[PDB]
Write a protein that binds this DNA or RNA. Structure first.
Lengths: 144, 64, 59, 192
RNA sequence: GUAGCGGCGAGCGAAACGGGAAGAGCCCAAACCAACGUUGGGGUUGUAGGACACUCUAGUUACAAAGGACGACAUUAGACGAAUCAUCUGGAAAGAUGAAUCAAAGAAGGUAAUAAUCCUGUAGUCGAAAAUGUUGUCUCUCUUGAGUGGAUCCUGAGUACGACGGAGCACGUGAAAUUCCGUCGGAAUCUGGGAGGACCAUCUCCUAAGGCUAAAUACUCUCUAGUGACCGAUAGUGAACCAGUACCGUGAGGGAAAGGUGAAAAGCACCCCGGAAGGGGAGUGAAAUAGAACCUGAAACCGUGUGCU
RNA sequence: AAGCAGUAAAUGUGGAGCCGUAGCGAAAGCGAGUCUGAAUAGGGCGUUUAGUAUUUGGUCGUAGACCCGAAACCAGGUGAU
């Protein structure tokens, strides 16, 4: 079938060539204009250049700072806990190998954006004020 | 090589959830005796980069 | 042949800075002095640094 | 003799994924090894031929410029590679599509085994006549077999490989497919 | 392209963790024990070592001290090596048309045209007077290791460090730690000393001011095998020709143009015009509008004849 | 991804790593909510929330960057026939 290969429809297009006649429309000038800076070989003004007027970033002032002891957590809402068995024990070591948490940055925090639908026992580092309200309402008990 | 980020611009804006950029205001360093109370009070609020300035500095913040 | 006989102290190169922070190359010579020190065959005249001559020495 | 799986030999070939697979294997076989000299690489041509003004000649700056005879190439070939990658799942699907395409043409035959004690090309050629195969045949094996490969590499249009050394270029090129009974089951578990 | 640096402008730009390739570590100074500024012993450090008192039968010259005698694989000439005959068109067969063959050999290059079986080769299998290199063995040399106390002793100084002037660390003297040079002042001694980004306290981790050490990495004049959706004589190295040579410059330097008869020289014996050059016949050849100003022979440009004007 | 085994094949292994599923604030922090504020009083940005890998085409950035052309600057050498 190597003599009858056929690509997909609309998946290949041919490149445009400039400066190869007038019938194409991209011939002598090739689409640059007439006797300007943008028509010369080598480029033009840099991206943020405004032609002499003060740039927007120079006009605006700086704000804030960075903290060296920034701690981040991997959030897990109450919607992603509908797959485990009823009454099972959920631990960070399991969530990282089951397929819910791909990378535990600095711990697992459980939020409450949704309903649990099951009675479980959860072990995590931090719990939302509403995550524990609904975890202890469906049975079981959480712990840090 | 990879493109470099405009360090001067990274200190003056932040990326929102919808792809916008939040900035600060101008006329806030000094000379407060020449401005009105309402004028100074309403300048403490933040704004967003206009739709015309984004077309010029898009690639400047492609990694933020 | 311009260096201490008891050590290897020699000259180096650096910069000369002005108020506007302009740079100009310059040298940092060593405090060499002609002295006659005891050698196994007989005394001779050599270049000895002032740092080595401190705390006492034989001449 | 005739046994099916319907999951590695019965799927419908995805021709859109087969094209990119064949095109990807054809670009990785070519070594560039081509280059030309440019303004700076040519020999000589450091001084200026003549001064800018003071005659009816055109201004020049070096005798090795693009418009000069024997000096300078502007944009020529450069040593580069042509290979690229593709997701792993798309690789396995393009392979299962080639195996199913053959069974759709009655081009797959399972044999018992090979008992070639020594390498004889004529004996192997007589084997292909009994099975009534086309002029080009691809032979598959569980593991390397020197005698089976020895007695067959000289015949024109005949290619021999292993179960785990298959590609889309050989399967598509071969007119018929001959695979051992046991080797066929091994290729099954690998494709899943 | 993160932290950070920056007329905080233009721009510059880390490291430690985590995944890999590779992977062994040792010798001195000092305390001390014997000799009259040769090195003779002794000893080498943080889960603190040694001196000093104390239980008591392997290493190899690529670091760790270094000097040789002893068997096998490769490198530098080679050898053997399967299988074809007719007919038609040709100046010539390998082409076409039929019938036979070898393959662990259908990689290639030649041969009067397009050859697996005509030639040189290929697959495969053998070979080394003598000379190198890589090693393996015994030979050869060199070879005493655990040391429970622990009061007294020992380590490397005009060094560490500070001030002033410079440089270097992604880091422009800045709140700048860590590392260096010149000039001056100048510590401590195991209850010691240094670091953890000024500086102090606590805690934690290390032990400077002596030396040596293979492998994983970088590069290619020039070798021996090879490879290419690279060039094909204005291209490809400046140079496919005897080229860094004709030529140019006082000199340092600059630098070209020039491939192709035919399968086989079979390179036109002889006659005629002419002083020669050149030419017309004859002859060679398949072809001489293939005769060395030699394959094919485009355009510009220069001539002769002629239908219409 | 590097690496390892493979015909310089492009396959198999390799899950450090990167993006997405949740924002808001200078930050501590809180979280389908958050910031400002005495005050969910009002207002700002989010709850609109599908993504990701490879690749053809268009444009931009760092590299000479579509081609040819200066008056000059610096470094090391050659020249008083």
């Amino acid at each position: 079938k190597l003599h009858e290969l056929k690509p997909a429809e609309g998946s290949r297009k041919e490149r445009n060539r400039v400066g190869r006649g007038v019938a194409t429309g991209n011939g002598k000038t090739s689409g640059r204009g007439h006797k300007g800076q943008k028509a010369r070989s080598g480029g033009g003004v840099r991206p943020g250049f405004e032609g002499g007027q003060l740039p927007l970033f120079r006009r605006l002032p700086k704000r804030g700072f960075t903290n060296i002891n920034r701690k981040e957590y991997a959030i897990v809402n109450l919607d992603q806990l509908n797959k485990f068995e009823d009454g099972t024990e959920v631990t960070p070591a399991l969530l990282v190998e089951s397929g819910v948490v791909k990378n535990e940055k600095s711990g697992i925090k459980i939020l409450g954006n949704g309903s649990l639908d099951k009675k479980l026992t959860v072990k995590a580092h931090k719990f939302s004020a509403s995550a524990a309200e609904a975890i202890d309402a469906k049975g079981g008990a959480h712990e840090v | 090589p990879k493109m470099k980020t405009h360090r001067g611009a990274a200190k003056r804006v932040k990326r929102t959830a919808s792809g916008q950029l939040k900035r600060s205001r101008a006329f806030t360093s000094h000379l407060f005796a020449n401005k009105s109370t309402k004028q100074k009070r309403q300048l403490r609020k933040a704004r967003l980069v206009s739709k015309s300035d984004m077309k010029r500095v898009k690639q400047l913040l492609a990694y933020k | 042949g311009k260096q201490c006989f008891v050590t290897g102290r020699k000259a180096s190169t650096g910069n000369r800075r002005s108020h506007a922070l302009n740079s100009t190359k310059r040298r940092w010579n060593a405090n060499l002095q002609k002295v006659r020190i005891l050698v196994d065959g007989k005394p001779k005249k050599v270049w000895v640094s002032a740092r080595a001559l401190k705390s006492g020495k034989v001449t | 003799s005739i046994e099916l799986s319907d999951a590695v030999f019965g799927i419908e070939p995805n021709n859109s994924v087969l094209f990119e697979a064949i095109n990807l294997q054809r670009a990785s076989l070519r070594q560039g090894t081509h280059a030309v000299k440019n303004r700076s690489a040519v020999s000589g041509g450091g001084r200026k031929p003549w001064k800018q003004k003071g005659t009816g000649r055109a201004r020049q700056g070096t005798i090795r410029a693009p418009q000069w005879r024997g000096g300078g190439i502007v944009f020529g070939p450069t040593p580069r590679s042509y290979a690229y990658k593709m997701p792993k799942k798309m690789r396995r699907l393009a392979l299962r599509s080639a195996l199913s395409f053959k069974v759709q043409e009655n081009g797959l035959t399972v044999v018992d085994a090979f008992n070639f004690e020594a390498p004889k090309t004529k004996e192997f050629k007589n084997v292909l006549s009994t099975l009534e195969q086309p002029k080009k045949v691809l032979v598959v094996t569980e593991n390397e077999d020197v005698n089976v490969e020895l007695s067959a590499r000289n015949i024109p249009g005949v290619q021999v490989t292993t179960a785990q050394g298959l590609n889309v270029l050989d399967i598509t090129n071969a007119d018929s497919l001959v695979i051992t009974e046991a080797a066929a089951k091994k290729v099954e578990e690998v494709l899943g």
